[PDB]
């Protein structure tokens, strides 16, 4: 019978050490079966529904909970909500500001004047003069991300408790909701990487034969259309400037990690998508979408909202990138998307719970696969 229960975290490898402390290697997550079985159920029919599926809600809840617990014991940055004296960095003849703070030291009677660099996106002016505030002081306290904790996605298997089973649909063309004819039983799912992104889905599983378009109600413009690609497109992303990290004491064993001086040239973060692969991929998506509308299909840049929705938000290397995709949703060159980086984050629309992402020294290079798109809709077009 159909049921909703508690599933457990399982992983493939125990190759993860205790230095990295990956949140998806919690040491509270069990190993899975190294030689898993799958039983094909012959002569059965099962109705699957991805939009009403409760495994999705449970995965979502586990992730939010995991992040809150991981950040629970780490340093609070409420002492930094002080007037910031900021000027531009010597990237002169943009987006990085050199700010001075008055910070209480381990001895409560004294404050020290210290400096840090901030990205423009994290700092809001108070005055028309050189007087600024961090963007969160207006709404919430910031918890500093734990400097020793990796948030790199590790494939997680969701496995059934005793008395329960997980059915898998093996119809290659299965789309949204409806019957699946080839059904099999497993103890658990394949590993799923908990990758966070907003416009382009990264590092997922590709469709077996063709682009598959999935929606709850394809005629409702308010619904997200999830497009699964049958071929991946690579993205090369980087953070080209060499950062340094400045450790600032803000209390008795309470350390704040500030961006220190930038070494060498100051350059803009960016992502590289091959033009030819993108062109055929986006055109194939328009072709497949057409089968459900019979209209000419075109793409446009997003309409507006905050950066999480208007840009391709993603994490890479622990850094948080917001890339401009107007050049995608519109030769043999490479499409280079400018990207911005920010450290003060409110994940999953949970306004009121801010996080500060400490700087990473050195340079960052990312390689990732676009495996799908999240699209919405607004004529013979």
């Amino acid at each position, epitope marked *: 019978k159909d049921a909703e229960t508690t599933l457990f975290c399982a992983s493939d490898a125990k190759a993860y050490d205790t230095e990295k402390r990956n949140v998806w290697a919690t040491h509270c997550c069990v190993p899975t079966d190294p030689n898993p079985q799958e039983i094909v159920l012959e002569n059965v029919t099962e109705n699957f529904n991805m939009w009403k599926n409760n495994m999705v809600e449970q995965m979502h809840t586990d992730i939010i909970s995991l992040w809150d617990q991981s950040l629970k014991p780490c340093v609070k940055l409420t002492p930094l909500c002080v007037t910031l004296n900021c000027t531009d960095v*010597n*990237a*002169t*003849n943009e987006e990085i500001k050199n700010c001075s703070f008055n910070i209480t030291t381990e001895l409560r009677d004294k404050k020290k004047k210290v400096y840090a660099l901030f990205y423009k996106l994290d700092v809001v002016p108070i005055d028309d003069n050189n007087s600024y505030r961090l963007i969160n002081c207006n709404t919430s306290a910031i918890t500093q991300a734990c400097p020793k904790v990796s948030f790199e996605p590790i494939p997680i298997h969701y496995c059934a408790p005793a008395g329960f089973a997980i059915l898998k649909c093996n119809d290659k063309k299965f789309n949204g909701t409806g019957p699946c004819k080839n059904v099999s039983t497993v103890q658990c799912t394949h590993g799923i990487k908990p990758v966070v992104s907003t416009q382009l889905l990264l590092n997922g599983s590709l469709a077996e034969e063709e682009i598959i378009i999935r929606s709850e109600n394809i005629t409702n413009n308010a619904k997200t259309i999830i497009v699964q690609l049958n071929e991946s497109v690579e993205i090369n992303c980087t953070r*080209p400037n060499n950062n340094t990290r400045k450790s600032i004491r803000i209390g008795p064993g309470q350390w704040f990690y500030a961006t220190g001086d930038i*070494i*060498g*040239d*100051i*350059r*803009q973060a*960016h992502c590289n998508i091959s033009r030819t692969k993108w062109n055929k991929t986006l055109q194939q998506v328009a072709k497949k979408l057409r089968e459900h509308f019979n209209k000419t299909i075109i793409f446009n840049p997003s309409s507006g909202g905050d950066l999480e929705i208007t840009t391709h938000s993603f994490n890479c290397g622990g850094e948080f990138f917001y890339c401009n995709t107007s050049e995608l949703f519109n030769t043999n060159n490479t499409i*280079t998307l*400018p990207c911005r980086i920010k450290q003060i984050i409110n994940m999953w629309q949970r306004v009121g719970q801010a996080m500060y992402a400490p700087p990473i020294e050195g340079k960052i290079r990312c390689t990732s696969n676009i495996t799908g798109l999240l699209l919405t809709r607004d004529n013979n077009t």
Partner: antibody
Amino acid sequence: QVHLQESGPGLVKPSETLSLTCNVSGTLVRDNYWSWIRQPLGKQPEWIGYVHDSGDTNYNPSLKSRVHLSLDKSKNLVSLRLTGVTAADSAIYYCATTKHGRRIYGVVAFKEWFTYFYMDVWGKGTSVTVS
Amino acid sequence: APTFVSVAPGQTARITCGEESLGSRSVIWYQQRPGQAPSLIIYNNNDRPSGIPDRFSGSPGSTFGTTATLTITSVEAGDEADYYCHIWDSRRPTNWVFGEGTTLIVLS
């Protein structure tokens, strides 16, 4: 070859306008960038400014308000004019050809590059003093 | 303004000029013999215009925190001169004034 021959009054008075020229021979005045260099006696030289066609002219910010440069396409001369002459303007003045290149350090599309200039053919220069 | 280097004929001289770099640089070096207009030795760190021998070779503009250096190997008596650098640094305003030079004295 290219010869640049400077010419001027030699001695001018304070608050007078100084006007120097440069007879260009072997090239046409609009073929390259021109620049003027000033070397106070015993000091390292200063770049006064550079002039070219298409409006690509700029001046040393410390002099800019008192300086004008131009190309005479009829006489194939390069001119330099300094107003408000003072004690600080006593120097050797030189006419030189300017060539350039580009240094790229990042993404070209993001303008992560700069133009640099160097002086190739130098004239002999003239000595200009004030009193 | 100038500093000094004393080099015996045939020895290598090391001439430095300018402050520590911040970003990528294109350094231009000029040589001034007494009584003469200065002339170009190298541009873009290592590019010699025709007529300049390969005994004149500069430091790269690819690193940071260093200073411009012109190495003159096998110094000849004819190399006695005031050497100046003009530093174009990607993180600083155009430098309209050449840096203070070095007088290279050949001890001949």
